[PDB]
């Protein structure tokens, strides 16, 4: 048995350094000690061909598994499996594997969400669909792992081939992020990460442009270099001051998922205007005429009463509309993010509000001072 | 040797604390020891007072199984204060606020063990809305 | 016949699951036990035994009693996932041990440092610097993991005396997996 | 002001956005009740200052200020 | 399973049970005439959330 | 081991349901 450690000197880096001191690991039969080194050599820079031989020392050290956590267990056969990558073996071995310990531990749901991974990329809906609902009703009683949590997220989130879940995929990346503890990523992953939320957020049918993004941290440390013709995008939809002359280089960063879809964009950018608009104005005279809506939204005359009537059917506005006037009325009850600045008019309004209240309450006290008594 | 005017003073917690037991469990009759410190030859204090489940044929001398007794009495020094126990709950709850020769069988031994413990009688049927 | 109480510090860490005294380590931490305090109260029926663990900062599984069943069924279940604390650790059978009752029992804290600490150079000021003008008694086993001979963990038991003290002493058992006996023999107490 | 106590519960739901995780504490509202036979309780237990309807005029200004 | 059966046993040896009674008129809102199947009649209403 | 787990460990039913048992038949007062 050990003579298979003993003769894998050659075959793989770090020899002296790894292997002959490990093997006095396993002399004083020790572990997880041994567990820890071997996460570090599984994550160590290698093609992963030599995946039988570790494997089978794994079954080895594995057969009395106990000090084996189940956590880390489940973390090195999914990296096995994933630098086998043979599709059926694959598979089979996760199986045998989750089965094999299948403890009330909550490792169990890392090996399903890496067998929701594994038969990601085939056959996505039979058993795909029906597993990710069973991790996620599964994953519960213990909110503080953080890590299998992030994983079933990730899954989710590489879901996103597929139209329907998309508000719930930007629900998912957003979790990723939240929960990933740290950013903890290369600056390489973490550019696509951020363009993929960034490009779901601009295209789902709810979404607008959620605000705190900007100032969310996957974006920023990872765009502010170059390529950032979406932040301008997303600067712009949350300003919505049309500003659609980003849209002639946005569409030749990316044609395909921003040309294809320029009219629901654009709907999307004329209901934020007219929003944005309407927050602008300081809330006194919040009834605005059909020029001001057409000449901050290029619409027609005609049509702003349509626009208008689309806001308050999506239900960002809680208005009414009128014409004899050619005026119209709002009230709110969506709000959105702000700034430092912006909040400087909200505590100059609550001071004037604190120092009338004050003078109201004294004048009261004073006056009616003989019979509060 | 000789008693007076003399005044029982009986916290705000105490008092709530009988009320709510005597209420309880009005169709039957209560028992609850009560605690205290013996201030001075005429001002006997109670701080708080504390219940023993309803056990036996009713108010007697069964009240005072040692077993619970004790066991209540240590774990509250524990945390607060050991004030010696002084008077009981007891409860007549449609008798208006008389001592039977049971009654008074019972606080004999009481009396014995003190020299001057109190018994009280707190109604729970007549005593509503504004009266005690 | 006894002037002193008990409370225990059962390791709980991860590194806990090894073989390296016996079957999966802990499994022996539990084999004193039984003997563990059963030698303690193998003396005069008044001795009291308690029990804290030490991983994820540590909760206390038994409050000072002259009973021991109640230590071994929590014992049964003391799964060991976690990095170990101390100090922190200490300073909870400190309190538990000052809420003792009967005064004439002195204290005892008997450490199982198993699996490496965390603790900085100069712990002393809080580990030791009191059992002094608290009189209070500390022992450390040492559940192999004599890291560079724990020096860190020795120091404990330095701070320790300064004339007369150590307890029983900070006896770190060979990590030759030969049984209890050295904590069944070796401790005189 | 009128904080005799505040109730908080211990829910570890992780987080939205993109926040970290937490201990994160939450509120439920409280108000102090009553029970029957103990409102005579603290009926006789106050009696003097008797905050009812009372001088309802007098007390509805006292209310406003 | 013995003490779990012991419980609830001593637990339920609190209830003091009602009397049976059938309502007569709705006086108020919160006020019911109400009878009991002994023969004397009496004033009621629900009690905090019927 | 599995018996220390169980001989005073455990089958404390002998003690409790005993003095449990105990209350309940105290309870039961001469008049029915
Ligand atoms: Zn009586």
Redesign the pocket.
């Known amino acids: 048995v050990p003579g298979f450690l003993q003769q894998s000197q050659n075959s793989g880096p770090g020899q002296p350094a790894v292997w002959h001191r490990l093997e006095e690991l396993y002399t004083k039969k020790l572990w997880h000690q041994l567990t820890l080194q071997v996460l570090d050599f599984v994550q160590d820079p290698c093609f992963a061909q030599g995946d039988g031989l570790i494997k089978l020392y794994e079954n080895f050290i594995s057969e009395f598994e106990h000090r084996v956590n189940p956590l880390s267990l489940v973390e090195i056969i999914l990296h096995v499996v994933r630098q086998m990558t043979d599709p059926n073996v694959a598979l089979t071995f996760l199986e045998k594997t989750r089965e094999k310990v299948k403890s009330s531990d909550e490792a169990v749901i890392l090996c399903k969400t890496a067998i929701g991974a594994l038969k990601l990329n085939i056959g996505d809906l039979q058993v795909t669909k029906e597993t990710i609902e069973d991790v996620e009703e599964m994953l519960n009683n213990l909110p503080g792992v953080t890590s299998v949590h992030s994983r079933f997220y990730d899954l989710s989130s590489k879901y996103y081939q597929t139209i329907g879940n998309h508000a719930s995929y930007y629900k998912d990346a957003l979790r990723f992020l939240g929960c990933v503890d740290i950013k903890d990523l290369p600056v390489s992953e973490q550019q696509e990460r951020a363009f993929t939320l960034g490009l779901a957020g601009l295209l789902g049918e709810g979404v607008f442009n959620f605000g705190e993004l900007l100032m969310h941290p996957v974006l920023e440390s990872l765009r502010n270099t170059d390529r950032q013709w979406l932040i301008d995008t997303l600067y712009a939809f949350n300003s919505g001051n049309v500003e659609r002359f980003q849209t002639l280089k946005t569409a030749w960063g990316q044609q395909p998922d921003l040309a294809a879809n320029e009219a629901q964009l654009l709907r999307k950018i004329q209901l934020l205007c007219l929003m944005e608009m309407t927050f602008t104005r300081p809330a006194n005279h919040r009834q605005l005429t059909f020029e001001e809506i057409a000449k901050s939204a290029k619409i027609t005359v005609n049509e702003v009463e349509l626009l208008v009537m689309k806001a308050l059917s999506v239900g960002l506005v809680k208005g009414s509309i009128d014409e004899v006037d050619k005026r119209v009325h709002m009230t709110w009850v969506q709000p959105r993010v702000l700034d430092l600045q912006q909040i400087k008019g909200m505590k100059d309004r609550l001071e004037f509000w604190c120092t009338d209240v004050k003078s109201m309450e004294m004048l009261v006290e004073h006056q009616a001072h003989d019979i509060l008594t | 040797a000789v008693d007076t005017a003399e005044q029982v003073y009986i916290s705000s917690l105490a008092l709530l604390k009988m009320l709510k037991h005597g209420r309880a469990g009005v169709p039957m009759?209560v028992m609850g020891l009560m605690l205290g410190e013996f201030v001075d030859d005429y001002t006997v204090r109670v701080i708080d007072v504390f219940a023993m489940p309803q056990s036996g044929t009713?108010?007697s001398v069964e009240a005072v199984d040692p077993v619970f007794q004790a066991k209540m009495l240590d774990m509250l020094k524990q945390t607060g204060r050991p004030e010696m126990v002084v008077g009981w709950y007891?409860?007549?709850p449609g008798?208006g606020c008389?001592?039977?020769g049971?009654?008074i069988n019972?606080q004999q031994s009481f009396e014995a063990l003190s020299e001057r413990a109190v018994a009280v009688?707190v109604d729970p049927i007549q005593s509503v809305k504004g009266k005690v | 016949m006894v002037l002193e109480s008990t409370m225990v510090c059962v390791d709980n860490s991860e590194y806990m699951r090894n073989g390296d005294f016996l079957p999966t380590r802990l499994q022996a931490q539990q084999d004193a036990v039984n003997i563990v305090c059963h030698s303690k109260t193998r003396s005069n029926p008044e001795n009291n035994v308690g029990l804290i663990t030490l991983a994820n900062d540590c909760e206390v599984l038994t409050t000072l009693t002259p009973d021991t069943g109640r230590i071994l069924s929590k014992l049964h279940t003391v799964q060991p996932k976690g990095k170990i604390t101390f100090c922190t650790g200490i300073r909870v059978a400190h309190l538990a041990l000052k809420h003792r009752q009967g005064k004439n029992h002195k204290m005892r804290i008997i450490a199982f440092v198993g699996s490496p600490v965390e603790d900085n150079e100069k712990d002393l000021v809080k580990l030791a610097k009191r059992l002094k003008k608290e009189k209070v008694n500390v022992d450390i086993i040492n559940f192999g993991e004599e890291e560079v001979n724990t020096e860190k963990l020795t120091a404990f038991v330095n701070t320790l005396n300064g004339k007369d003290g150590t307890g029983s002493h900070l006896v770190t058992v060979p990590p030759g997996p030969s049984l209890a006996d050295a904590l069944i023999s070796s401790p005189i107490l | 002001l009128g904080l005799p106590t505040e109730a908080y519960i211990s829910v570890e739901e992780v987080h939205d956005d993109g926040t970290p995780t937490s201990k994160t504490f939450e509120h439920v509202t409280s108000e102090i009740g009553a029970e029957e036979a103990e409102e005579v309780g603290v009926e006789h237990l106050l009696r003097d200052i008797k905050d009812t309807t009372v001088g309802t005029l007098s007390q509805r200004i006292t209310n406003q200020v | 399973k013995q003490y779990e059966k012991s419980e609830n046993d001593l637990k339920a040896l609190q209830s003091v049970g009602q009397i049976v009674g059938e309502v007569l008129k709705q006086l108020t809102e919160e006020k019911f005439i109400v009878k009991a199947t002994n023969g004397p009649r009496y004033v009621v209403g629900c009690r905090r959330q019927l | 081991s599995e018996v220390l787990r169980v001989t005073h460990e455990l089958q404390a039913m002998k003690d409790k349901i005993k003095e449990n048992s105990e209350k309940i038949k105290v309870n039961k007062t001469l008049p029915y």
Do not use: C, M
Request: proline share 0%; no cysteine.
């Open positions: 009759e009713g108010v007891h409860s007549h008798f008389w001592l039977s049971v009654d019972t009688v």
